[PDB]
């Protein structure tokens, strides 16, 4: 199945709320956490703590302590180069994508005030700046060719290495399949008019696909977002207002038809 590993970094110029936070995710699951008020890398999922040695946490904590410091300095410089008044935020994101077909994807990005700032191209070994301020950072990061090379390999090989490892450490949670409970109920969305809701719940992974059909043709369709139920399973829905309709549904390989 198609999986991902991505770590996020967050820096805030005027904290209350920690100045720096970093959290890792295997798919939609938080697996690691670090903040400026604990100054210690801790696990989020129990299977992480069980499988990773005490030395792992010790070593990445010193790494993260140093990364926090670099984020402080970068955010101060960005703030001053903009002569930006008030509170501002710096964000980093790095990840993996081990696709079902064996292919991979790697990405590395930065964002100042929640808007794309520097995007890394691992094939060209370049940085994509959004403006004249981002550009002077690009000029400096593109100078150190060794770091660019180091990054490409981290994303292309090392990141996938780690992802595959974690998938084995938590195969009972990440590699599980909990099929949806699909139900169709008719409920008048306004006076006179009548709609059909295709409510689906208790499914995992959260990736699902709902849709309506008119004797076979795809219908005009109102939707409900995929939402966490709180039990580790997700929920979703879709709806439409003389013709015979059916709710065609696809989740984690199996595809369902619910003719009404």
């Amino acid at each position, epitope marked *: 199945r198609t999986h991902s590993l991505r770590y996020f970094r967050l820096g805030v110029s005027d904290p209350i709320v920690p100045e720096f936070i970093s959290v890792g995710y295997v798919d939609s699951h938080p697996i690691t956490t670090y903040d400026s008020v604990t100054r210690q890398k801790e696990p989020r999922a129990p299977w992480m703590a069980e499988n990773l040695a005490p*030395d*792992h946490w010790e*070593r*990445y904590t*010193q*790494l993260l*302590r*140093g990364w926090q*410091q*670099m984020f402080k300095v970068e955010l101060k410089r960005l703030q001053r180069h903009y002569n930006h008044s008030g509170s501002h935020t710096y964000q980093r994101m790095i990840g993996c994508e081990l696709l079902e077909d064996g292919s991979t994807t790697g990405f590395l990005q930065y964002a100042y005030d929640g808007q794309d700032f520097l995007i890394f191209n691992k094939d060209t070994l370049s940085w994509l700046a959004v403006d004249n301020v981002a550009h002077t950072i690009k000029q400096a990061w593109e100078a*150190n060719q*060794h*770091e660019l*090379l*180091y990054q*490409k*390999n*981290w994303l292309e*090989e*090392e990141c996938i*290495a*780690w992802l595959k490892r974690f998938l084995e450490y938590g195969k009972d949670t990440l590699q599980r399949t909990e099929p949806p409970l699909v139900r169709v109920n008719r409920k008048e969305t306004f006076p006179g008019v009548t709609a059909l809701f295709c409510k689906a719940h208790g499914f995992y992974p959260p990736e699902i696909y709902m849709t309506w059909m008119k004797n076979g043709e795809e219908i005009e369709i109102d939707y409900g977002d995929i939402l966490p139920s709180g039990d580790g399973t997700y929920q979703a829905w879709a709806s439409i207002e003389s013709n015979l309709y059916s709710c065609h549904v696809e989740h984690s390989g199996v595809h369902m038809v619910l003719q009404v």
Partner: antibody, heavy 108, light 116 residues
């Protein structure tokens, strides 16, 4: 998890010399070649992280991540090259794992 | 980048305490290293200096004999408390780059010889 390179190497002045370095590790984030003359601190020579041979003058540094193997190639060898050549790689948790270093003896 | 470490050579009696300072003359170093090279042996790492954190020691190193502290972001200082002729060695300082790939920059020297 360990790294290996020859203890000592002797070669005639003017010929190509290949210092092989072979590792094995769970994780890898690049390989360094350092040069260190007797009673002095080491000085950077190279950083290979992607597969292939990379030239940098008289010296060359090759890497095969797949074969867990690297080599420093000193060609058109000189008397000044009698030094010690340290090999080290960055493992999974960004720790530098040093080799014992090859002592290169240039016979004229 | 350049790292400088003073003194270059030092002679001290058995029982005294010698302090080797180490400064990165350009950039600020979040982490600095302490290496040692007994004649004749490989370059062995003995400690890791970290800003806003404690000092990490290795297999042989005894936290009671050496006193490393991250003074500034430019300065790290190793202090040999109660020196003995067995402690006499070549002490190299190192500073890691800001970037993650981990290139180190070494200080030249120091040659410490303890004499009773």
């Amino acid at each position: 998890q360990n790294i290996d390179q020859p203890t000592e190497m002797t070669a005639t002045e003017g010929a190509i010399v290949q210092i092989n370095c072979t590792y094995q590790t769970s994780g890898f984030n690049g390989l360094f070649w350092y040069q260190q003359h007797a009673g002095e601190a080491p000085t950077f020579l190279s950083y290979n992280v992607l597969d292939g041979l990379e030239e940098k003058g008289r010296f060359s540094s090759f890497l095969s991540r797949s074969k867990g193997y690297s080599y420093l190639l000193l060609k058109e060898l000189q008397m000044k090259d009698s030094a010690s050549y340290l090999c080290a790689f960055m493992d999974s948790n960004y720790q530098l794992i040093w080799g014992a270093g090859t002592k290169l003896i240039i016979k004229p | 980048a350049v790292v400088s470490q003073h003194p270059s050579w030092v002679i001290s009696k058995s029982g005294t305490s010698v302090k080797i300072e180490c400064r990165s003359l350009d950039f600020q170093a979040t982490t600095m290293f302490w290496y040692r090279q007994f004649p004749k042996q490989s370059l062995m790492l003995m400690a890791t200096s970290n800003e806003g954190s404690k000092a990490t020691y290795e297999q042989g190193v005894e936290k009671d004999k050496f006193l490393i502290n991250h003074a500034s972001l430019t300065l790290s200082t190793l202090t040999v408390t109660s020196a003995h002729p067995e402690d006499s060695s070549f002490y190299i300082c190192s500073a890691r780059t800001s970037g993650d790939f981990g290139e180190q920059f070494f200080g030249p020297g120091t040659r410490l010889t303890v004499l009773e």
